[PDB]
Ligand binder design. Structure first.
Ligand SMILES: COC1=C(OC)C(=O)C(C/C=C(\C)CC/C=C(\C)CC/C=C(\C)CC/C=C(/C)CC/C=C(\C)CC/C=C(\C)CC/C=C(\C)CC/C=C(/C)CCC=C(C)C)=C(C)C1=O
Ligand SMILES: CCCCCCCCCCCCCCCCCC(=O)OC[C@H](COP(=O)([O-])OCC[N+](C)(C)C)OC(=O)CCCCCCCCCCCCCCCCC
Ligand SMILES: CCCCCCCCCCCCCCCCCC(=O)OC[C@H](COP(=O)([O-])OCC[N+](C)(C)C)OC(=O)CCCCCCCCCCCCCCCCC
Ligand SMILES: CCCCCCCCCCCCCCCCCC(=O)OC[C@H](COP(=O)(O)OCCN)OC(=O)CCCCCCCCCCCCCCCCC
Ligand SMILES: CCCCCCCCCCCCCCCCCC(=O)OC[C@H](COP(=O)(O)OCCN)OC(=O)CCCCCCCCCCCCCCCCC
Ligand SMILES: NC(=O)C1=CN([C@@H]2O[C@H](COP(=O)(O)OP(=O)(O)OC[C@H]3O[C@@H](n4cnc5c(N)ncnc54)[C@H](OP(=O)(O)O)[C@@H]3O)[C@@H](O)[C@H]2O)C=CC1
Ligand code: SF4
Ligand code: SF4
Lengths: 178, 157, 43, 385, 198, 92, 315, 339
C-alpha cells in the first residue's frame, strides 16, 4: 500500500478569493505567524529538565552501569574462575589467571576488568554460572586518571561490597525474566 | 580578613568560579557518544542550565569532549583543534572508545585512547556513557576547576 | 502465565495522521484589517 | 574553485566528514567527500570474534538505528542455521524495529533542521526520543547499544509492563510530530532551502544504488518490508510513503510520513503480540535459561559451550537485507563451519548515498551542501565501518 | 526450523540456467543456495558482459548494485573472490555474480554498468588490493592517507604495524611500530568434533 | 562638545575593554555578483541622497514640481532595477 | 551633572545588555521545553557576569594577522552601538541633534566595516568570505532600511527623532505606515544579524568571530546585543509611539520600556521559531520582494502629504 | 633493577625509575620525552598546579609517569619523591631571582638537599645540571652560584655526574626566542655591537638525549660533561640570522653594557617574570668558553645538530604571513668563529 506525499491531485484554477488568500499568505507572512504561535505555546508548558544532582533520570533493574564482583552471604567470593566470562567478553577486557587457594578451593589470583576496553555489553552478567560478575547500577565512576579506570579484583570486590544491597534487589527483580 | 594570602585565595576563588560556571564545550562528535550528549543538550538533562553552552566554535571553547573512536585519520586533526583552542582549555574523554580503545582497541585504524593524542582531564566511562554520566563527568570537571589555585602558586613562587 | 501482553480486548486506538489545524482569518477579511488601519491612519 | 576543505569545520557533522570542495565564490563546482575518518575495522574485527560476540558490533555500525541493524545480523545468522525465531520474538523485533525507525527519523529530521538553523524542533523531539530510549533501557538494560536482538530471537522477554507504556507514548507522539509540522512542513522558509535542492531522477537513483527514502522520494516504489517481508512485517499493514518531485522537501515529507506509518505498525504490534517464548528452543543456537543450566547437566554443557565456543554455523554464505531506517542494510556473511565468521561485509545505506552527493549537489551553494548531507541521513559509522 | 518454499528454489534455479545459456562464454558455475539465493559464477573477463546483460535485459532487469565485496581465501590461487550482489526491483529478486581475482591480476571496473560501484571498488582496492581497470578515480577511501598495506587481507595483522601518539619533542603526531599493552588473546575455539556430513 | 565628551568616553570604554582583554589574561574569492552588488548599492545610495532632502522640500511652495521631480527620480531608478532584474544581475 | 547623565544612559544599558543574553537563554529554553540557566546565582541572574569574566580571562589568542584591525575592529563595533544610544529620545534625549535619524542611519552604516575589517584581519580565506556575506547584506538591507525611514520622515517633517513624540500624540505611526513597519522590523532583523537573517556565523561555522575569542569576541558580542536593543528601541519610537505626557515624562519611558522589551522579546522568539534563509534567498527578498514595495510606498508617502493637504510642519 | 624487556617503544620497559624535580622546564619537557619514549619509570615532582603539567601526561605511558606534590623549603617532600627512584636528575633553575627564592636556592641550596636525600635513599646515580663556563668567580651571580653548587653536591653525593650545558637552542628556548623577540624593540641593543662574545648553541634534544644516555651508561660517574654544539658564532651573525629567519629588520646598535646592565635591572623589577635580567645580560655577553673538557654530545652518544637546521621551526612563529611559507634554503646561514 503506498501513499503520495507532496503530490497535487489536481490543478485548482485560481479564483480571486483563492488568489487573495494566497497573496495575503505571501504579503502578511500568515504561515510564519502560525509558527511563532507554536513556540509561544510551549514557552507556557512546564520544562522537562531534572535537577541533575538532586533528581536522577530513572534507570530500571537491568541497567548495566558499572562492573562489580559479588560474594556469597557467608563471605566467600562467588567467582570460581571458570573463566568463560573472559571467553565471551567481546572486547577482551576481562583478564583472569587462577590457582588453587590454600583452602583448596578454586579462586582467581587476578581478575582485571579494563573498563576503558569494556563496552558494557552485559554478556559477562549473562555468562557467569555462579553469577559472580554483575552489571552494577552505578554509572557515575568518571575518573581523573586513565589508570583508575583499569580495575583489579580488589576494586571490583570492593565495588561489589558497596553496592551489594541494590545489586541483590536488582537481580531479585529480574531473575525470573532470565 | 587581612593578609595578601587571603586576598589571593579569594580572587582565584573568583577566577575559578567564572571558568567553572561558564564552560563552553567543544564536542569532537566522533562515533555515537556525541548522541549521548546531544541528549545532555536536550531537555531531560539540560547542560545550559549548568552554564555549559550547546555548541561553540573551537576558538571559543573551554572544554573538549571527545566522543567516539579516535581513528588514526582523525588523530592528526583532534590535536590540531586541541592546539587551536584558547589556552584555558580542558578535555573530557567520553566513551570507552575514546578513553582507551574500547571495542576496536586492537584495530589497526583506531588510536588506543585520546590520551595518546590530547592530555585528558576527566575520563567518562561506558560504551554509550549515559548522559547523566557525562553530566556527572562535566560536574567533576567543575570540581577539578574549583580546586585549581593558579594565583596562590604565583604568589608563593 | 504472567508475561507482558496486550490487555484483554486489545489496546485503544492511536492517531498517526497529521492533525495540523487549518485555522485562520479569511484573506479578504484579513486585507481589510491592514487596509483599514492605513485608511484611518492616513485620515 | 578554491578548495576549502569544509567539513572538518563540524558544519553538517553527522560524524566527521572532510568534504573537500572547489568553490567558485559561493557556488560548488565539485564535491569529493572523504571517508574513513571513522573507519575502525568493524569488518576485520568480526572475523576474530564468535557470532554472539560480534552482535554488539552491529549496534555500533549505525547507532541511531541501534536495533534495526541487529535484526539484519540476526536474520542473517538465523538463515545460515536455518532456524527461525519464536512468534513472540518476531513481533518484538518488529515492535522495537519500528520504535527504532522513529528514533532515526526524529534524529534525521531534527538534526537536518539544526544545520538549516531551526533549533527548537530538535529539543521538542529529543524529549520524545529520551522517552523511547527508556523503553530500550527497560527492555535491554542499555539506553542505546542494547544487544537485545540476538541471532535466535530476543534476549529476554519484555518487562512486565512495557507494552502499556509503549502505548501511552504512541498514543501521544503523533501530536509531537504534528507540532514539528506546524513549525517546518509549511514554513515559508523551510520550503525554500529544501524545495528543488538535490533532485535525483528515478533512473539515476536506482543506478547509483540509493535504495532508501532517497529512491522512494523519487517515486520508485520499493520497501524491502513489503517486497521481501522479513520477520512478521508481513502480518502488519502499513502504507509506504512514496514521493514525487523528489527533492529535499519531498523526501523529508516521506520521513515524517514513515514516522506516522510506524506508529500504525507499533499500534498493531501492541494489539497483536502473542503469548510464547522469546528465543529459539534449540539450546544448540540459543543459550539455556539460567534456572535450567543450574539444575540440568545438558543445559550447563550447552551454556558452557555456547558462551565459550559458539553456534558453529553450517558453512555457507548469505546476503540478507532489511529496511533499516536509513535504507537497505545488508550483511553478506560468509561462514565456514567454524563458530567465528569468515567475512561480514556490511552494506551500509550511506556508502551509496554519500557517493551521490556529487551527482546531487551540482551548481549549488555552500548552504545547499549542508542541506543535502542532511537529506541522506549520513551516519559515518555505517559508511566508515 | 526455518520455513522454506521450493517455489523460489525452482524459479531461481531456472533463471540460473537462463543466464548461463545466454552468457555461456563466461558462466562457470551457477548455484542456488539452500537459502534460495542464486550465485552465478563468472570468469573475471565476464565482469562487464554478465553485469550488463543483467542490468539491461527485459527478462532479467537487475538495476541496483547492493554490494561489491571481496572475500580472501588465502589458500585459493586466485586469492580474492569479488562478489557482486544485485537487486531487481522489477522482479523482486537478487542474484550474486562472483568472480575470482589474484593480487596482481586486475578485474575490469563496472562503474560503467553501475555507478554505485565507483565507491565500493575503491573500498575493495583499499582493503584487499585488487585493482580495477578503467576506474575513474581509484584511490584509498577508508584507510589513512599514508597507510601502507591492504587491511582486510587475511595475511594482515589485526593490530597492524603502526599506531599514532603525539610527541612533544617534535610537536606533531608520529607513527611508531605498534607496541600493545595486552596482546589480543587468541582464544582457540574450534572443537575437535564435527557436526554433520556437510 | 557635549557630543565630543560622550564619544571619547565611548571609545575609552571600548579601548579599556580590549586592553584588559589582552592584559588580564596574564586568496582569490571573487564573484562579479559581489562587486556588482556593491556598485548597485552606491547607485541606490546616491539616490538615497537625492531623496534625503525631500523632508525640507515638502514644504517648498511649488509642491507640484517637487512631486513631479521626486516621482521621476524614484521611477527612473526603479527602472534601473527593472533592467537589473531583467539582466542576469540580481540573479546571482 | 552631564557626566552623571553619561553613566546613566550607558551603564544602565550595559547592565540591561547583559540581562538580554540571560532572557534569551531562558525564553529560547522554555520554548524548547527546558529551564535554561538557573543554577548559577538565583534564577540565573549572575549568569551573564560569569561568562564575561571567563571570556576576558581566556587567552586573546590573537591567533598570522594584520594586528591593528584585530584590535581596532572589535572597538568600533561596541563604540558605534553604544554611541547610537546617545541621541535616542527616551523622553528627553541626551544630546538632541536636529538631524538625529541621519546620525542613527550613518552610525549604523559604519558598523559594516567592523565586519569587513575583522574578516580581512583573520588570515583564513574562509573568514574573508564570511565577512563578505555580512558586509554585502548589511549595505543591501541598508538601502531599503534608509528608504523606509525617508518615507517616515516625510510624514514627520524633520530628521530629529524628538519630533515624532509630537507627531504620535494621537496615534502610533503603525496604523498609518504599518506596511513599512513590517519592512522595518524585518530589516531590523537583518541588520542585527539575528536569526531569520543570520547567514553570518552560519554554516561557515554554526564568520567574523571565527578567529575572535575572549575579549575581542566579547566586544562585538556586546555590540550586537546592545544593537539588538537599540534597533528595537528605534522601532518603539518611530512606529510604536509610547504615550507622552509633558507633566510626567517617565510614563513615556515606562511604555518605551514595555514596548522595547516586547519587540526585543520578538526577535528572540523569531530566532527559535524560524530556520535561517539562504544567502541569495536573503538578497532575493530585499532586492525583489521589498525594494520595489519600499520605493513605491516611498512615492505614496510623498503623495499622501500633498493631495491630503497634510504636508507636515517643519520644526 | 628492572630487566629491560620490550621492542623499544612506548608500552615497553627500560628499568630506569627516575625522579626529575624540575621537569616542567624547557629542558625538562624534553628529558621526560625521551625517558618516557624509552619506557623508563619517571617520577615528576611538581609544585605548579596540575593544569600546567598536563603537557607531560601524554608523554610516557600509563603508570609510567607519576606526579608528586613537592615544596623546595619542605625537606620531607624531596624525601618521599626519591624513596623509590634509583636515578635522580636535577634541572632546578631560574634566571630571575624570585622574591622567595634566591639564585643560591635555585642553584646551590636546593639542588644540594635533593642529592643529599637521594643518597640517604640509595639512588644509584644523580645527574646535576649547571650552566656552562661557570666559574666560582664569574660575573653573573647566577653562574657563580651554580658553580658553588656543583662543588657542594659532590660532597652530599660523590661521583654524581655533572653535565654542564651551554645556553640551549630549542623551540621555547630563550637564547633563540629572546633575540627574535627584540622585534618589539625598534632597535636591538647589542653590547660591543654584538662582538667578542662568540657563542655555541646546542639543540635541546641533543642535550636531552645526552642526559638520558647518561642515566643508562656506566661510563659516566663523576663526569662533568659539556654539551656544546656543532658550530660557534659571534653574537652578531646569530642575532642577524635570527632576524633573518624571522624576516624582520636587523638594526645592530651598540649599547654600553654599564648602561645596559641597568636596562636589565629595569625589566628585572617586573613582578611577572622579568623578560631580561641583569644576571641575564651579563650571561648573554659572557663569552662561550672553549671546548677542552670531558666531551658531552658524541661522547655520550648523540651527534650535535647544527642550529640552522632546526632554527626554522623555533623562529617560525615570529614571522609574518608574508614570510610564513619562506624556507631555510631561501635564507642565508651565519658564520662560525673558531675563535
Ligand atoms: C549564538 O549562541 C550563543 C553563543 O554561541 C556563539 C554564545 O556563546 C553565547 C554567549 C553567552 C552569553 C550568556 C552572553 C555573553 C555576554 C556577555 C559577554 C556580557 C558581557 C557583560 C558585561 C561586560 C557586563 C556589563 C559591563 C559593565 C557594567 C562594565 C562597565 C565599565 C550566547 C548568548 C548564545 O546564545
Ligand atoms: C498575546 C501573544 C499573541 C501572539 C500572537 C502570535 C502568536 C500566536 C499565533 C497563533 C496562530 O497560529 O495564528 C497565526 C495565523 C495563522 O494563519 P494561517 O497562516 O494558518 O492562515 C490564515 C491566513 N490565510 C488563511 C489568509 C492564509 O496567522 C494570521 O492570522 C495572520 C497574521 C498576520 C501577521 C502580519 C505580520 C504581523 C503584524 C504586523 C503589524 C503590526 C502588528 C502589531 C505588532 C505589535 C504592536 C504592539
Ligand atoms: C591617524 C592618521 C591616519 C592613519 C591611517 C592612514 C595611514 C596608515 C599608515 C599605516 C602604516 C603602517 C602601520 O601602521 O603598520 C601597522 C599596521 C599593519 O601592520 P600590523 O600592525 O597589523 O602588524 C602586526 C605585526 N605584529 C604581530 C608583530 C605586531 O597598519 C595597518 O594597516 C593598521 C592600522 C595602523 C595604525 C592606524 C591607526 C588608525 C587609528 C584610527 C582611529
Ligand atoms: C497598501 C497595500 C499594503 C500591502 C502590505 C503588504 C505587507 C507589507 C509587508 C510585505 C513584505 C513583502 C512580502 O510580501 O514578503 C516578503 C517575504 C516573503 O516572501 P516569499 O513568500 O518567500 O515570496 C518570495 C517571492 N519571490 O517575507 C519574509 O519572508 C520575511 C522573512 C521572515 C522574517 C521573520 C518574519 C516573521 C516576523 C514576525 C513578527 C513581525 C512583526 C512586524 C511588526 C513589528 C512591529 C512594527
Ligand atoms: C569611532 C568612530 C565613530 C565615532 C562615533 C560616531 C560619531 C558620529 C558623529 C556624527 C555627527 C554628529 C553631529 O553632527 O552633531 C553635531 C553636534 C550638534 O550639532 P547640530 O545637530 O546641528 O545641533 C545644532 C543646534 N542644536 O555638535 C557638534 O558639532 C559635534 C561635532 C562632532 C562631534 C564628534 C564626536 C567625536 C566623534 C569623532 C571621534 C574621533 C576619534 C575616533 C576616530 C575613529 C576613526 C575611524
Ligand atoms: N638555556 C638553558 O635553558 C640552560 C639551562 N641550564 C640549566 O638547565 C636547567 C633547566 O633549565 P630550564 O628548563 O630552562 O629552566 P626553567 O626556567 O625551564 O625551569 C626548570 C624547572 O625548575 C623548576 N623550578 C625553578 N625554581 C624552582 C623553585 N624555587 N622550587 C622548585 N622548583 C623550581 C621549575 O618548575 P616551576 O616552573 O613549576 O616552578 C621548572 O620546571 C636549569 O637549572 C639551568 O641552570 C643550563 C644552561 C643553559
Ligand atoms: S564467570 Fe563468573 S565465575 Fe566464572 S570466572 Fe567469570 S566471574 Fe568468576
Ligand atoms: S564508546 Fe561505545 S559508544 Fe562511545 S563510541 Fe566507542 S562504541 Fe560507540
Amino acid at each position: 500500500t503506498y501513499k503520495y506525499v507532496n503530490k497535487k491531485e489536481q490543478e485548482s484554477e485560481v479564483d480571486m478569493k483563492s488568489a487573495t488568500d494566497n497573496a495575503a499568505r505571501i504579503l502578511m507572512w500568515t504561515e510564519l505567524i502560525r509558527g511563532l504561535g507554536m513556540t509561544l505555546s510551549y514557552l507556557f508548558r512546564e520544562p522537562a529538565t531534572i535537577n541533575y544532582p538532586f533528581e536522577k533520570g530513572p534507570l530500571s533493574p537491568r541497567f548495566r552501569g558499572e562492573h562489580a564482583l559479588r560474594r556469597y552471604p557467608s563471605g566467600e567470593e562467588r567467582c570460581i574462575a571458570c573463566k568463560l566470562c573472559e571467553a565471551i567478553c567481546p572486547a577482551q577486557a576481562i583478564t583472569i589467571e587462577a590457582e588453587p587457594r590454600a583452602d583448596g578451593s578454586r579462586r582467581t589470583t587476578r581478575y582485571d576488568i579494563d573498563m576503558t576496553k569494556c563496552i558494557y555489553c552485559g554478556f559477562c552478567q549473562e555468562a557467569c554460572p555462579v553469577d559472580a560478575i554483575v552489571e552494577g547500577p552505578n554509572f557515575e565512576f568518571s575518573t581523573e586518571t586513565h589508570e583508575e579506570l583499569l580495575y583489579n579484583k580488589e576494586k571490583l570486590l570492593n565495588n561489589g561490597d558497596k553496592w551489594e544491597a541494590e545489586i541483590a534487589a536488582n537481580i531479585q527483580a529480574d531473575y525470573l525474566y532470565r | 580578613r587581612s593578609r595578601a594570602e587571603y586576598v589571593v585565595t579569594k580572587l582565584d576563588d573568583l577566577i575559578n568560579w567564572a571558568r567553572r560556571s561558564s564552560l563552553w564545550p567543544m564536542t569532537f562528535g566522533l562515533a555515537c557518544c556525541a548522541v549521548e550528549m546531544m541528549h545532555m543538550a536536550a531537555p531531560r538533562y539540560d547542560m545550559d542550565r549548568f552554564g555549559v553552552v550547546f555548541r561553540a566554535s573551537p576558538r571559543q571553547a573551554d572544554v573538549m569532549i571527545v566522543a567516539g573512536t579516535l581513528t588514526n585519520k582523525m588523530a592528526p586533526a583532534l590535536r590540531k583543534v586541541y592546539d587551536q583552542m584558547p589556552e584555558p582549555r580542558y578535555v573530557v574523554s567520553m566513551g570507552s572508545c575514546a578513553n582507551g580503545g574500547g571495542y576496536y582497541h586492537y584495530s589497526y585504524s583506531v588510536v588506543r585512547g585520546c590520551d595518546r593524542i590530547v592530555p585528558v582531564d576527566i575520563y567518562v566511562p561506558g560504551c554509550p556513557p549515559t548522559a547523566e554520566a557525562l553530566l556527572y563527568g562535566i560536574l567533576q570537571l567543575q570540581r577539578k576547576i574549583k580546586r585549581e589555585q593558579k594565583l596562590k602558586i604565583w604568589y608563593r613562587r | 502465565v504472567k508475561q507482558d501482553m496486550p490487555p484483554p480486548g486489545g489496546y485503544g486506538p492511536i492517531d498517526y495522521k497529521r492533525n495540523l489545524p487549518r485555522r485562520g482569518l479569511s484573506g479578504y477579511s484579513m486585507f481589510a484589517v491592514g487596509i483599514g488601519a492605513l485608511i484611518f491612519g492616513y485620515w | 574553485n578554491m578548495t576549502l576543505n569544509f567539513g572538518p569545520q563540524h558544519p553538517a557533522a553527522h560524524g566527521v566528514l572532510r568534504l573537500v570542495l572547489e568553490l567558485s565564490g559561493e557556488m560548488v563546482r565539485k564535491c569529493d567527500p572523504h571517508i574513513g575518518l571513522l573507519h575502525r575495522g568493524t569488518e576485520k574485527l568480526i572475523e576474530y570474534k564468535t557470532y554472539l560476540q560480534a552482535l554488539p558490533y552491529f549496534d555500533r555500525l549505525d547507532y541511531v538505528s541501534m536495533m534495526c541493524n541487529e535484526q539484519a545480523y540476526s536474520i542473517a545468522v538465523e538463515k545460515l542455521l536455518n532456524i527461525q525465531p519464536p512468534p513472540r520474538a518476531q513481533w518484538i523485533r518488529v515492535l522495537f524495529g519500528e520504535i527504532t525507525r522513529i528514533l532515526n527519523h526524529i534524529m534525521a529530521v531534527t538534526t537536518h533542521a539544526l544545520d538549516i538553523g531551526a533549533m527548537t524542533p530538535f529539543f521538542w523531539m529529543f524529549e520524545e526520543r529520551e522517552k523511547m530510549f527508556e523503553f530500550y533501557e527497560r527492555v535491554s538494560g542499555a539506553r542505546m547499544h542494547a544487544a537485545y536482538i540476538r541471532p535466535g530471537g530476543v534476549h529476554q522477554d519484555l518487562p512486565l509492563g512495557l507494552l502499556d507504556d509503549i502505548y501511552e507514548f504512541s498514543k501521544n507522539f503523533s501530536l509531537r510530530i504534528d507540532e514539528v509540522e506546524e513549525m517546518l512542513t509549511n514554513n515559508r522558509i523551510w520550503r525554500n532551502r529544501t524545495v528543488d535542492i538535490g533532485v535525483v531522477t528515478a533512473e539515476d537513483a536506482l543506478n547509483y544504488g540509493f535504495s532508501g527514502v532517497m529512491l522512494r522520494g523519487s517515486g520508485i516504489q520499493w520497501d524491502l518490508r513489503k517486497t521481501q517481508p522479513y520477520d512478521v512485517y508481513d502480518q502488519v499493514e502499513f502504507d509506504v510513503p512514496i514521493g514525487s518531485r523528489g527533492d529535499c522537501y519531498d523526501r523529508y515529507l516521506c520521513r515524517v510520513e514513515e514516522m506516522r506509518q510506524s506508529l500504525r505498525i507499533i499500534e498493531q504490534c501492541l494489539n497483536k503480540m502473542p503469548p510464547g517464548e522469546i528465543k529459539v528452543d534449540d539450546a544448540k543456537v540459543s543459550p539455556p535459561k539460567r534456572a535450567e543450566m543450574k539444575t540440568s547437566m545438558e543445559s550447563l554443557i550447552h551454556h558452557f559451550k555456547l558462551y565459550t565456543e559458539g553456534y558453529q554455523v553450517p558453512p555457507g554464505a548469505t546476503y540478507t537485507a532489511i529496511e533499516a531506517p536509513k535504507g537497505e542494510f545488508g550483511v553478506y556473511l560468509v561462514s565456514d563451519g567454524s563458530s567465528r565468521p569468515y567475512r561480514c561485509k556490511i552494506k551500509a545505506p550511506g556508502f551509496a548515498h554519500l557517493a551521490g552527493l556529487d551527482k546531487m549537489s551540482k551548481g549549488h551553494m555552500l548552504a545547499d551542501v549542508v542541506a543535502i548531507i542532511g537529506t541522506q541521513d549520513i551516519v559515518f559509522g555505517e559508511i566508515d565501518r | 526450523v526455518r520455513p522454506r518454499s521450493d517455489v523460489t528454489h525452482k524459479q531461481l534455479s531456472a533463471f540460473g540456467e537462463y543466464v548461463a545459456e545466454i552468457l555461456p562464454k563466461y558462466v562457470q558455475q551457477v548455484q542456488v543456495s539452500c537459502l534460495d539465493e542464486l550465485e552465478i559464477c563468472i570468469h573475471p573477463d565476464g565482469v562487464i558482459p554478465t553485469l550488463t546483460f543483467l542490468r539491461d535485459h527485459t527478462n532479467a532487469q537487475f538495476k541496483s548494485l547492493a554490494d561489491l565485496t571481496a572475500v580472501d581465501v588465502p589458500t585459493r590461487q586466485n586469492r580474492f573472490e569479488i562478489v557482486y550482489n544485485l537487486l531487481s526491483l522489477r522482479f523482486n529478486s537478487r542474484i550474486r555474480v562472483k568472480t575470482y581475482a589474484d593480487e596482481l591480476t586486475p578485474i575490469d571496473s563496472i562503474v560503467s554498468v553501475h555507478i554505485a560501484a565507483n565507491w565500493y571498488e575503491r573500498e575493495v582496492w583499499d582493503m584487499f588490493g585488487v585493482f580495477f581497470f578503467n576506474h575513474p578515480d581509484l584511490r584509498r577511501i577508508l584507510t589513512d592517507y599514508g597507510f601502507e598495506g591492504h587491511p582486510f587481507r587475511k595475511d594482515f595483522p589485526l593490530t597492524g604495524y603502526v599506531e599514532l601518539r603525539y610527541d612533544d619533542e617534535v610537536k606533531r603526531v608520529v607513527a611508531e611500530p605498534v607496541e600493545l599493552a595486552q596482546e589480543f588473546r587468541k582464544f582457540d575455539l574450534n572443537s575437535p568434533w564435527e557436526a554433520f556430513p556437510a | 562638545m557635549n557630543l565630543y565628551t560622550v564619544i571619547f568616553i565611548n571609545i575609552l570604554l571600548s579601548l579599556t575593554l580590549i586592553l584588559v582583554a589582552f592584559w588580564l589574561p596574564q586568496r582569490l574569492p571573487f564573484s562579479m555578483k559581489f562587486f556588482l552588488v556593491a556598485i548597485t548599492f552606491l547607485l541606490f545610495d546616491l539616490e538615497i541622497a537625492l531623496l534625503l532632502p525631500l523632508p525640507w522640500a515638502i514644504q517648498t511652495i511649488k509642491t507640484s514640481t517637487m512631486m513631479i521631480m521626486a516621482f521621476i527620480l524614484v521611477t527612473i531608478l526603479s527602472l534601473g532595477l527593472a533592467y537589473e532584474w531583467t539582466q542576469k544581475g540580481l540573479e546571482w | 551633572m552631564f557626566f552623571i547623565n553619561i553613566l546613566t544612559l550607558l551603564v544602565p544599558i550595559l547592565i540591561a545588555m547583559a540581562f538580554l543574553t540571560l532572557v534569551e537563554r531562558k525564553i529560547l529554553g522554555y520554548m524548547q521545553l527546558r529551564k535554561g540557566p538557573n543554577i548559577v546565582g538565583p534564577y540565573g541572574i549572575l549568569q551573564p557576569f560569569a561568562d564575561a569574566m571567563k571570556l576576558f580571562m581566556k587567552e586573546p589568542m590573537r591567533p598570522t594577522t594584520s594586528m591593528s584591525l584585530f584590535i581596532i575592529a572589535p572597538t568600533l563595533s561596541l563604540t558605534l552601538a553604544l554611541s547610537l544610544w546617545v541621541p535616542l529620545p527616551m523622553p528627553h534625549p541626551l544630546i538632541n541633534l536636529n538631524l538625529g535619524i541621519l546620525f542613527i542611519l550613518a552610525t549604523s552604516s559604519l558598523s559594516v566595516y567592523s565586519i569587513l575589517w575583522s574578516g580581512w584581519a583573520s588570515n583564513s580565506k574562509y573568514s574573508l568570505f564570511g565577512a563578505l556575506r555580512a558586509v554585502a547584506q548589511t549595505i543591501s538591507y541598508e538601502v531599503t532600511m534608509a528608504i523606509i525611514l525617508l518615507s517616515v520622515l516625510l510624514m514627520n517633517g524633520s530628521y530629529s527623532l524628538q519630533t515624532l513624540i509630537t507627531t504620535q500624540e494621537h496615534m502610533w505611526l503603525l496604523l498609518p505606515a504599518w506596511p513599512m513597519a513590517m519592512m522595518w522590523f524585518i530589516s531590523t532583523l537583518a541588520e542585527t544579524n539575528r536569526a531569520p537573517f543570520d547567514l553570518t556565523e552560519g554554516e561557515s561555522e554554526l564568520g567574523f568571530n571565527v578567529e575572535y575569542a575572549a575579549g575581542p569576541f566579547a566586544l562585538f558580542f556586546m555590540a550586537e546585543y546592545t544593537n539588538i536593543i537599540l534597533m528595537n528601541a528605534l522601532t518603539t519610537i518611530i512606529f510604536l509611539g509610547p504615550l507622552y505626557y509633558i507633566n510626567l515624562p517617565e510614563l513615556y519611558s515606562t511604555n518605551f520600556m514595555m514596548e522595547a522589551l516586547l519587540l526585543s522579546s520578538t526577535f528572540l522568539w523569531i530566532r527559535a521559531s524560524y530556520p535561517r534563509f539562504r544567502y541569495d534567498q536573503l538578497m532575493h527578498l530585499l532586492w525583489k520582494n521589498f525594494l520595489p514595495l519600499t520605493l513605491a510606498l516611498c512615492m505614496w508617502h510623498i503623495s499622501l502629504p500633498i493631495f491630503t493637504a497634510g504636508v507636515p510642519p517643519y520644526m | 633493577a628492572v630487566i629491560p624487556h620490550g621492542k623499544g617503544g612506548r608500552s615497553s620497559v627500560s628499568g630506569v625509575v627516575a625522579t626529575v624535580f624540575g621537569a616542567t622546564g624547557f629542558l625538562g619537557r624534553y628529558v621526560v620525552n625521551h625517558l618516557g619514549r624509552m619506557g623508563s619509570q619517571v617520577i615528576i615532582p611538581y609544585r605548579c598546579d596540575v593544569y600546567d603539567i598536563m603537557h607531560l601526561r601524554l608523554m610516557g605511558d600509563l603508570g609510567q609517569l607519576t606526579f608528586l606534590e613537592w615544596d623546595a623549603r619542605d625537606k620531607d617532600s624531596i624525601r618521599k619523591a626519591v624513596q623509590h627512584s634509583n636515578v635522580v636528575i636535577n634541572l632546578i633553575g631560574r634566571e630571575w631571582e624570585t622574591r622567595n627564592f634566591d639564585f643560591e636556592d635555585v642553584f646551590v641550596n636546593i639542588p644540594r638537599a635533593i642529592a643529599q636525600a637521594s643518597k640517604e635513599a640509595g639512588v644509584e646515580r644523580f645527574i646535576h645540571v649547571s650552566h656552562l663556563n661557570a666559574s666560582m668567580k664569574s660575573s653573573s651571580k647566577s653562574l657563580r652560584s651554580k658553580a658553588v653548587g656543583e662543588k657542594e653536591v659532590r660532597s652530599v653525593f660523590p661521583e654524581a655526574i655533572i653535565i654542564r650545558p651551554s645556553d640551549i637552542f630549542g623551540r621555547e628556548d630563550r637564547f633563540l626566542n629572546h633575540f627574535a623577540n627584540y622585534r618589539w624593540f625598534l632597535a636591538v641593543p647589542l653590547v660591543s655591537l654584538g662582538f667578542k662574545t662568540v657563542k655555541q648553541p646546542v639543540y635541546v634534544a641533543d642535550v636531552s638525549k645526552g642526559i638520558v644516555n647518561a642515566t643508562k651508561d656506566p661510563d659516566a660517574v663523576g663526569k662533568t660533561f659539556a654539551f656544546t654544539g656543532p658550530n660557534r658564532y659571534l653574537l652578531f651573525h646569530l642575532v642577524k640570522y635570527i632576524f633573518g629567519m624571522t624576516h624582520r629588520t636587523f638594526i645592530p646598535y651598540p649599547l654600553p653594557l654599564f648602561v645596559y646592565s641597568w636596562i636589565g635591572k629595569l625589566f628585572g623589577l617586573s613582578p611577572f617574570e622579568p623578560w631580561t635580567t641583569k644576571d641575564k645580560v651579563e650571561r648573554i655577553h659572557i663569552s662561550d668558553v672553549m671546548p677542552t673538557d670531558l666531551p658531552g654530545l658524541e661522547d655520550l652518544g648523540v651527534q650535535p645538530t647544527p642550529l640552522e637546521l632546526k632554527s626554522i621551526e623555533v623562529l617560525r612563529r615570529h614571522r609574518t604571513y608574508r614570510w610564513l611559507s619562506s624556507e631555510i634554503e631561501e635564507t642565508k646561514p651565519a658564520k662560525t668563529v673558531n675563535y
